Design a protein around this nucleic acid. Structure first.
Ligand SMILES: [Mg+2]
Ligand SMILES: [Mg+2]
Ligand SMILES: [Mg+2]
Ligand SMILES: [Mg+2]
Ligand SMILES: [Mg+2]
Ligand SMILES: [Mg+2]
Ligand SMILES: [Mg+2]
Ligand SMILES: [Mg+2]
Ligand SMILES: [Mg+2]
Ligand SMILES: [Mg+2]
Ligand SMILES: [Mg+2]
Ligand SMILES: [Mg+2]
Ligand SMILES: [Mg+2]
Ligand SMILES: [Mg+2]
Ligand SMILES: [Mg+2]
Ligand SMILES: [Mg+2]
Ligand SMILES: [Mg+2]
Ligand SMILES: [Mg+2]
Ligand SMILES: [Mg+2]
Ligand SMILES: [Mg+2]
Ligand SMILES: [Mg+2]
Ligand SMILES: [Mg+2]
Ligand SMILES: [Mg+2]
Ligand SMILES: [Mg+2]
Ligand SMILES: [Mg+2]
Lengths: 51, 206, 185, 203
RNA sequence: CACGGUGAAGAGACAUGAGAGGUGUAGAAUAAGUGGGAGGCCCGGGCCGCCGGUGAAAUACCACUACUCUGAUCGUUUUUUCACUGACCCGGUGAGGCGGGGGGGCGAGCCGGGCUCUCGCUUCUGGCGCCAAGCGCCCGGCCGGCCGGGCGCGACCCGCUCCGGGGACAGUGCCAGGUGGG
RNA sequence: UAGCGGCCCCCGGCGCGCCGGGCCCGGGUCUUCCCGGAGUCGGGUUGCUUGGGAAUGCAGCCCAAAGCGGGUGGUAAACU
RNA sequence: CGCGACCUCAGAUCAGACGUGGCGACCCGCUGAAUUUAAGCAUAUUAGUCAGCGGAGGAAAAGAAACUAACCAGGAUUCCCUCAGUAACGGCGAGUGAACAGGGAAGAGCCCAGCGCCGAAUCCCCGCCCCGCGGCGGGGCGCGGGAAAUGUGGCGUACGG
């Protein structure tokens, strides 16, 4: 589900990605935290890709 | 946006200066691109970026002002022009558009934006002329150098803009401060966050 | 389909590298209870009238002195009972630059120390005679594991069928191949 | 140490390495009997977290338990009463399947005391739990001052009175406003103390 | 929903990213809109323009994106079909010759020889059939003779599931609707 | 029976003394390091339970964590 | 082929121990009704009660906060008085029904894993000698055997180290 959520965020369906993460992990605060660290690791891959 | 890959981009164009060695005047720019905002739809963002260095060497400026904007303007070497001189300009819509198209951006005093929509309101925004007011402090020395390069991020009939920032002769950390100002002002000005972008080409002009 | 973090333990040192490593390891063995009791007696008959370098054993000791950078070579057995005791350990050694090798036999690796089994051993220091020997071992070992880790990390194991099914597919695909040769005649 | 790496790697159960190992091992433990001796803990750091020490006296007995609820064992699904007690199918057992594993391990090896237990794998039909048992008459346990609470006769069959971890989790015990029904030591103690009549001498 | 996987096609979604057409004229055409621009490129000279000219935004110089179409390969998932087996299941057996590779007897077409297929020794009768003959190579005891053993062919070799049959479906666990005077 | 009444055994508890062995141990000030229990929490659903009422507790099933985090703060939910 | 490690798994009337069963007033874990009341009865009530099953001890359980609170804050658990037949639950009907604060009885705290350092510094068993020998323990000697590096012991645990 974490791979599916970064796949949603790659296509930038961020609201549906947050809803799917909420359906997976439960509480909205944990969902926001999960989506934030998936954005962080996806940004890490994108900032690795340019070099 | 983050700053590490922007550092990588400015390093690769600081060493891409040797790829070019410019002679059509040394200046660079960047682009900004957006993904899914409708070009014909509402929530149109329209703002000004204050920039502190002005990394654009020949910024083309004139003043349109009343008395007490004469002697200090002649001592700072910016051409001055009066209300009856604007009547002289208003005598045809032939030469005034050409002078305003040769010049880039104007600035004007308090009571002459009252007289700029006589019959020439729609004539002057045809070339994008909203002249910016001065103040009662009456000190335009380097305040014109501050008012210039305030880049207008404006939405119009397609979804992209370009911003005139940079020369590699200037210092790198101030240049990335300029691009930081541009990108965080547009990310705040957008209807959503920095997800709306595609990429940033802070490249050379030529 | 075995994941690569487990499949990396199937690729090991060969016979020559294993014997050259064991020959070095036989000289840095930790002393047994007999040659520690008599070592106590030998210390006492001269002090009551420095520690030589040894092998560090076990996942906790080896893990702790790998993350402290203090290891110079680490040997990990291929066949521990839960593999999760050491499945992180090649990744840890690669990030902290420690030369790691995977050796066949926790029985051999716990016959180095005087026990039954051990998961891993580590050379922290060696004597000045064996510094060139550890240099030649490390230059042989690092070309297989530490420099090949980005290829090792994506190499999946298993996924090979039974010989009866491989033979059936082989007969079917060679029938298809010879029929495809008969297509053009 | 290595144990934090092992612990954080056991926490990522949906990863590929863990899914492979849980699948392979769960097949292995499904191939064996429902109650069998394990030569060592499968989860060493989890076992020592719950109280295992690798010394003589600690044994591991691995248990297979059947998943699901508790179907009410009435003949042909007929509970002869009011319709609130007509439930047969969707009922649940008050204790967890882990505590069921501990009580099966203890009732087999009645000469050993249940210390704790932990989860090692599952599929749709079984849950697998490793139970740590201890021999209170071995001299290592009998002569370690730090471990001899279990030697005392009050710790006979902790798993059958719910004094283990998975046993005490099912009793509703705890501190605070969520656990007002176990003031005393139990639901029993609270109900007895509240549903009594203190008839004093002098009223 | 879960246990519950492997591969190949069909059908989508068109993401990374390749190529590409723009007419109320005016004007160097056919400027999709915009930021800004005083002197490249080509190698002192040359080139349209930025300016003239001038229209609904004036085009040099470098720019971003688009609207839509198309192709490409890893869109990555979803879906259908066809297969696989290792989960699971069923059957048989004292889990007794399974699968390949040989080697041998026939056939097919060529010059004693290479290649494809095939077969493997029991049907004339209400007998009998195990506990090895034979061959070869070693070893021992008593003065080449006697006595007494061992190994190997006979009974080919290599393997990773006993052999088949199904198979990610039966099934089981938990929910959901229907049916339910048993 | 009464009694700080008696006598004789026994079993302790309580003090001092000897031999052998063990233990050869702290507080304050400053500096440098380190620190946590996962098919668990939590979510949904189901069933039981509770005074706990948009769910008090427990359990099955499914999902399934994080670390300036988590739990609680008796009305579901978002922001602080 | 053969030998030896290790792992996993057997066998033994192998050496030494331990469990079973009873009692069950009190205690712990499950399982768990219906009579009854509601002037009928199905939710409710009876009742988490009886019956059933398992496990103990001289007490058990509980217990040193993933607590109460919102205060000028308290401070493990257990028990008594009061809170209080109250908040609250309830075909909001019948009925059910706590908790905190307060006063007392009692009063006590602590330990691991984990993180780290110390030549595994740790444990068990057999042989000999001396003692004590009816709770099988103390000292010393064993080039005596195992366990344990898939982590024993010493320090150390959120009050910080
Ligand atoms: Mg119950
Ligand atoms: Mg107790
Ligand atoms: Mg819980
Ligand atoms: Mg019926
Ligand atoms: Mg009827
Ligand atoms: Mg008397
Ligand atoms: Mg109830
Ligand atoms: Mg709040
Ligand atoms: Mg509230
Ligand atoms: Mg015996
Ligand atoms: Mg009635
Ligand atoms: Mg009546
Ligand atoms: Mg009646
Ligand atoms: Mg009830
Ligand atoms: Mg009873
Ligand atoms: Mg009993
Ligand atoms: Mg008793
Ligand atoms: Mg307790
Ligand atoms: Mg209290
Ligand atoms: Mg009152
Ligand atoms: Mg009640
Ligand atoms: Mg109180
Ligand atoms: Mg330790
Ligand atoms: Mg300790
Ligand atoms: Mg604490």
């Amino acid at each position: 589900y974490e791979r599916r959520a970064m796949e949603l965020l790659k296509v930038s369906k961020d609201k549906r990605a947050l809803k799917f993460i909420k359906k997976r992990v439960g509480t909205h605060i944990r969902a926001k935290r999960k989506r934030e660290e998936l954005s962080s690791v996806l940004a890490a891959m994108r900032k690795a890709a340019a070099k | 946006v983050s700053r590490d890959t922007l550092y990588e981009a400015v390093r690769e164009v600081l060493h891409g200066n040797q790829r070019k060695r410019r002679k059509f005047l040394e200046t660079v720019e960047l682009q900004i691109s957006l993904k899914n905002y409708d070009p014909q739809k509402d929530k149109r963002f329209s703002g000004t970026v204050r920039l502190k260095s002005t990394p654009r060497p020949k910024f083309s400026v004139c003043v349109l002002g009343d008395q007490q904007h004469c002697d200090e303007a002649k001592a700072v070497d910016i051409p001055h022009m009066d209300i009856e001189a604007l009547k002289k300009l208003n005598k045809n819509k032939k030469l005034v558009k050409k002078l305003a198209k040769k010049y880039d951006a104007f600035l004007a005093s308090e009571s002459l934006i009252k007289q700029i929509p006589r019959i020439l309101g729609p004539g002057l925004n045809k070339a994008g002329k909203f002249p910016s007011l001065l103040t009662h402090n009456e000190n335009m020395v380097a305040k014109v150098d501050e008012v210039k390069s305030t880049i207008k991020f404006q939405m119009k009939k397609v979804l992209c803009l370009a911003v005139a920032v940079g020369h590699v002769k200037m210092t790198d950390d101030e240049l990335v401060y300029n691009i930081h100002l541009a990108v965080n002002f547009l990310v705040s000005l957008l209807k959503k966050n920095w997800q709306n972008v595609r990429a940033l080409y802070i490249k050379s002009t030529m | 389909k075995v994941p690569p973090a487990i499949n990396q333990f199937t690729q090991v040192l060969d016979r020559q590298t294993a014997t050259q490593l064991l020959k070095l390891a036989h000289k840095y063995r930790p002393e047994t209870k007999q040659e520690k009791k008599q070592r106590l007696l030998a210390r006492a008959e001269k002090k009551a009238a420095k520690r030589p370098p040894v092998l560090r054993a076990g996942v906790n000791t080896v893990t702790t002195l790998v993350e402290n950078k203090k290891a110079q070579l680490v040997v990990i057995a291929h066949d521990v009972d839960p593999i999760e005791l050491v499945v992180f350990l090649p990744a840890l050694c690669r990030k902290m630059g420690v030369p790691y090798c995977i050796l066949k036999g926790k029985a051999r690796l716990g016959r180095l120390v005087h026990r039954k089994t051990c998961t891993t051993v580590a050379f922290t220091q060696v004597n000045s005679e064996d510094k060139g020997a550890l240099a030649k071992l490390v230059e042989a070992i690092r070309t297989n594991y530490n420099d090949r880790y980005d290829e090792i990390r994506r190499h999946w194991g298993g996924n090979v069928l039974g010989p009866k099914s491989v033979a059936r597919i082989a007969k079917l695909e060679k029938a298809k191949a010879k029929e495809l040769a008969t297509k053009l005649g | 140490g290595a144990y934090k790496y092992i612990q954080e790697l056991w926490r990522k159960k949906q990863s590929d390495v863990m899914r492979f190992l849980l699948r392979v091992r769960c097949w292995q433990y499904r191939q064996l009997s429902a109650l069998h001796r394990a030569p060592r803990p499968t989860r060493p750091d989890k076992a020592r977290r719950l109280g295992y020490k690798a010394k003589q006296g600690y044994v591991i007995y691995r248990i297979r338990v059947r998943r699901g609820g508790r179907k009410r064992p009435v003949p042909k699904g007929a509970t002869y009463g009011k319709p609130v007690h007509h439930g047969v199918n969707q009922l649940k057992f008050a204790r967890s399947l882990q505590s069921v594993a501990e009580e099966r391990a203890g009732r087999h090896c009645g000469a050993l005391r249940v210390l704790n237990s932990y989860w090692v794998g599952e599929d749709s039909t079984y849950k697998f739990f490793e139970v740590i048992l201890i021999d209170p008459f071995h001299k290592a346990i009998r002569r370690n001052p730090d471990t001899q609470w279990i030697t005392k006769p009050v710790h006979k069959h902790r798993e059958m009175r719910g004094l283990t971890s998975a046993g005490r989790k099912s009793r509703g015990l705890g501190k605070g406003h969520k656990f007002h029904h176990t003031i005393g030591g139990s639901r029993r103690a609270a109900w007895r103390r509240r549903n009594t009549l203190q008839l004093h001498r002098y009223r």
